[PDB]
Amino acid sequence: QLNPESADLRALAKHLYDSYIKSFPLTKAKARAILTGKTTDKSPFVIYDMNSLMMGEDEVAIRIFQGCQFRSVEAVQEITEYAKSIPGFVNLDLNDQVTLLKYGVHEIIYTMLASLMNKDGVLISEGQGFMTREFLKSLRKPFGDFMEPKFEFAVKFNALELDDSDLAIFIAVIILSGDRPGLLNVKPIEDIQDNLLQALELQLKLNHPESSQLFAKLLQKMTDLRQIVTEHVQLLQVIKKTETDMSLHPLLQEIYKDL
Amino acid sequence: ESADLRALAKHLYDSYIKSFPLTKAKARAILTGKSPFVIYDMNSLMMGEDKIKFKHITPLQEVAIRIFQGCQFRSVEAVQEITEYAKSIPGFVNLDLNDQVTLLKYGVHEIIYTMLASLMNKDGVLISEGQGFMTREFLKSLRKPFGDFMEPKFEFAVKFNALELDDSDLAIFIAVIILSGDRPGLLNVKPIEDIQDNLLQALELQLKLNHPESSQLFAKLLQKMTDLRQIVTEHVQLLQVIKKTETSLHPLLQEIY
Numbered sequence: 419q420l421n422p423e424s425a426d427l428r429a430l431a432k433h434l435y436d437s438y439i440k441s442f443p444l445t446k447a448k449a450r451a452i453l454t455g456k457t458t459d460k461s462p463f464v465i466y467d468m469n470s471l472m473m474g475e476d477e478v479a480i481r482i483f484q485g486c487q488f489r490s491v492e493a494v495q496e497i498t499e500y501a502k503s504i505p506g507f508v509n510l511d512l513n514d515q516v517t518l519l520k521y522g523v524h525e526i527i528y529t530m531l532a533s534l535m536n537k538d539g540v541l542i543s544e545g546q547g548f549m550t551r552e553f554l555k556s557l558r559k560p561f562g563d564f565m566e567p568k569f570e571f572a573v574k575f576n577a578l579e580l581d582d583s584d585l586a587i588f589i590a591v592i593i594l595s596g597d598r599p600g601l602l603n604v605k606p607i608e609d610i611q612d613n614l615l616q617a618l619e620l621q622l623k624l625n626h627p628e629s630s631q632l633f634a635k636l637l638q639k640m641t642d643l644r645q646i647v648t649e650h651v652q653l654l655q656v657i658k659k660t661e662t663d664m665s666l667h668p669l670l671q672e673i674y675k676d677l
Numbered sequence: 678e679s680a681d682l683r684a685l686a687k688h689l690y691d692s693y694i695k696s697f698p699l700t701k702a703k704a705r706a707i708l709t710g711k712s713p714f715v716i717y718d719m720n721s722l723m724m725g726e727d728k729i730k731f732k733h734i735t736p737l738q739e740v741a742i743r744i745f746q747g748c749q750f751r752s753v754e755a756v757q758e759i760t761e762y763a764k765s766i767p768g769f770v771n772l773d774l775n776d777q778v779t780l781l782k783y784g785v786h787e788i789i790y791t792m793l794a795s796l797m798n799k800d801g802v803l804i805s806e807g808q809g810f811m812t813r814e815f816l817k818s819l820r821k822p823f824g825d826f827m828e829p830k831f832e833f834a835v836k837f838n839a840l841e842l843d844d845s846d847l848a849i850f851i852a853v854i855i856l857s858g859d860r861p862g863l864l865n866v867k868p869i870e871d872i873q874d875n876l877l878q879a880l881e882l883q884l885k886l887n888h889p890e891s892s893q894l895f896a897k898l899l900q901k902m903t904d905l906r907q908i909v910t911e912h913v914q915l916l917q918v919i920k921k922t923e924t925s926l927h928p929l930l931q932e933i934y
């Protein structure tokens with residue numbers, strides 16, 4: 419029914435779930451509680467136009483983009499804190515540690531960003547705001563499409579119906595890759611992930627009995643992430659040329675470099 | 678064991694062997710221990726056309742261009758082998774005709790590189806039913822954009838072949854790839870996903886029974902699907918950049934491709 423074996427993997431599930439709660443202020447559970455309206459005090463102020471973008475504080479395209487940019491830098495921070503708590507992660511070559519974060523941080527950001535989205539928009543400013551997909555798609559030329567592929571992924575991905583205890587493990591599997599470019603020590607990294615994969619596989623089986631092969635369906639979604647990430651950097655480089663007065667955060671510049 | 682899955686597995690394996698001339702097992706014997714004609718440079722390629730007489734892709738009345746053309750001729754040839762295998766997958770044929778076309782259209786490039794891996798090692802790849810072996814370096818030896826056409830694939834193969842899968846495994850892995858419900862333009866996704874789910878259980882059992890030793894191999898293999906997509910898009914980009922050189926006379930040839 420559950421031997422020494424699984425028992426250890428559950429202990430790992432719990433451990434990761436706990437660090438996740440402790441590292442990310444806005445879990446999917448809270449995100450969805452705000453979005454479904456199962457509240458009165460948790461309801462968000464909606465921004466669907468310039469008019470409301472104004473009241474919402476109580477050119478824009480860039481004021482918004484740069485808003486995402488720094489929020490993004492903040493996520494790299496929360497994720498880096500989460501990584502450290504991944505058994506074995508800190509025991510690796512400090513170089514490989516940086517490499518895993520370099521390539522992993524964004525795929526993780528979009529995985530989690532889905533938790534704040536629904537087909538119509540996304541929660542912002544810690545859930546207090548809600549920016550609609552349409553207002554975002556209406557931004558001037560370039561910026562009008564930087565969020566669209568995120569919604570794309572989010573709708574398909576949210577369909578898997580995963581909760582925080584699931585994501586916590588899935589997000590760890592993402593960091594502990596190994597096929598990541600320039601890793602010095604691949605075996606050590608692969609020994610961790612193999613362990614994380616069993617954790618997720620069991621976690622999903624127990625958490626979603628009625629959902630068969632969800633493990634594989636979740637694993638296949640990683641292709642979507644890479645594509646998303648690539649597309650982002652690409653749209654990112656273009657903007658760099660069009661808007662030369664707009665900066666980019668150093669940290670963020672170090673992640674996209676040689677990426 | 679759900680004999681139903683152990684069945685779908687043998688079925689798929691049986692079809693894989695009938696649809697594909699050169700198998701992973703066959704190709705691993707050559708690479709290791711009637712040796713193929715080795716093509717390591719320009720002169721060896723020359724004698725190769727008269728020897729290997731792989732002149733099915735060449736008689737068409739520029740070394741880097743005749744090589745690239747040659748790969749495409751094989752690619753087309755493979756597409757038919759894949760299309761035939763596809764029809765062996767339980768239920769594939771019963772799908773909406775358009776969706777069957779859609780699945781094959783977006784899966785062929787992924788399956789080709791997946792199987793191309795079977796024919797290559799870190800130092801080269803097997804060509805023409807395995808009669809040849811074009812070295813990997815003579816391929817970087819190519820100028821223009823032709824010097825990085827295959828390189829991204831040797832890299833993929835090295836990571837992929839490391840999984841040490843065999844034809845019984847690849848047979849199911851490929852079925853899974855074709856049955857991808859995220860192909861743009863599909864009309865009725867449910868059927869395709871149900872079948873893929875079904876194919877996923879078979880590949881899972883296949884790998885646990887065939888590779889008890891390797892932990893989570895199923896999971897690791899699925900991950901390779903990422904590198905595959907990346908390999909394909911990147912490849913499609915090359916075919917774009919290459920579209921700036923030139924283009925029985927061509928008119929009809931350019932059409933077949």
Ligand SMILES: O=C(O)Cc1c[nH]c2ccc(O)cc12
Nearest residue numbers: 486487489490493527531670
């Ligand atoms: O990827 C980046 O560095 C910037 C970025 C663009 N759009 C986003 C939406 C949410 C988020 O957290 C960050 C971003």
Ligand SMILES: O=C(O)Cc1c[nH]c2ccc(O)cc12
Nearest residue numbers: 442443444445446530531533
């Ligand atoms: O629900 C998730 O997967 C986590 C998540 C996504 N976006 C966020 C922005 C801020 C924050 O504290 C947490 C999150």
